[PDB]
Amino acid sequence: DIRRAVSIESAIEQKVVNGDNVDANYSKVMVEPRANMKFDFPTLKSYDE
Amino acid sequence: STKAEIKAVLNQPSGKLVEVVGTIYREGKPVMEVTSQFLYRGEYNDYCNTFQKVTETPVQVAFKSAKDLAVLRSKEWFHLEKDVQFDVLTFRCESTYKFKSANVYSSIKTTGQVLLELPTKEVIQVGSVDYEAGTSYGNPVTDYLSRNGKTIEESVIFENAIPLSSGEEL
Incomplete structure (x- = not known):
């Protein structure tokens, strides 16, 4: 709990000093995934193969 | 006079x-x-010769759990000089702002005293508060006092x- 609370406090202290406008830029913009329904005919091997 | x-x-x-x-x-x-x-x-944009000195409202923060005492002891701006146990602490502080734009503070020097109420009704200062920074967006000591403690309001x-x-x- 103390390592949790001290972390929270130093996070919010930075969010005040540095301002809440750059701290969102520290959180990386993660990528949402979509579905990629293809049709994908059976894969043709090469001739010599 | x-x-x-x-x-x-x-x-x-x-x-x-x-x-x-x-x-x-x-x-x-x-x-x-x-x-x-x-x-x-x-209209005036002389953000260099502008400033502000304000005394803070004396805030009364109450320490109950054991993290709280470590919470502020982690704060490098907090600095106690007496190693006495304390339950509730009153923070009487003052600040000195120096602005750099509409809302960025080119400097903040916020010194103040932390006080302990003894059962003998004798109040002894536990330590000092010494914050100092540049290009900030708020006084961290005041914010931390606000959310984590109530003021001695009159x-x-x-x-x-x-x-x-x-x-x-x-």
């Missing part, structure tokens, strides 16, 4: 506010304080005000 010092010089959107407080003296002892407030109406307000006299005789 009269001694007065200037406190607030800040470029508001409406102009250059100036606040002065005058501590009037009588045989050396100060008698009363007069706080005036002017305004150079218009203006207790009624839930319903009362009219003193009614009519037009005023």
Whole structure:
């Protein structure tokens, strides 16, 4: 709990000093995934193969 | 006699506010304080010669769990000089802002005292508060005092005000 609370406090202290406008830029913009329904005919091997 | 010092010089959107407080003296002892407030109406961007000195509301933070005592002891701006256990602490602080733009503070020097209420009703300062930074967006000490503790407020307000006299005789 103390390592949790001290972390929270130093996070919010930075969010005040540095301002809440750059701290969102520290959180990386993660990528949402979509579905990629293809049709994908059976894969043709090469001739010599 | 009269001694007065200037406190607030800040470029508001409406102009250059100036606040002065005058501590009037009588045989050396100060008698009363007069706080005036002017305004150079218009527009001014001299964000270099602007500043502000404010004394903070004395906040009373109560320590109950064991992390709390470590919480502030982690704060490099907090600095206790007496190793005595404490339950509740009153923070009487003052700050000195120096602005760099509308809302960025080119400097913040916020010193203040932390006080402990003994059962003997004798109040002994546990330590000092010494914050100092540049290009900040708020006073961390004041914020931390606000959310994690209540102030020693003096203006207790009624839930319903009362009219003193009614009519037009005023």
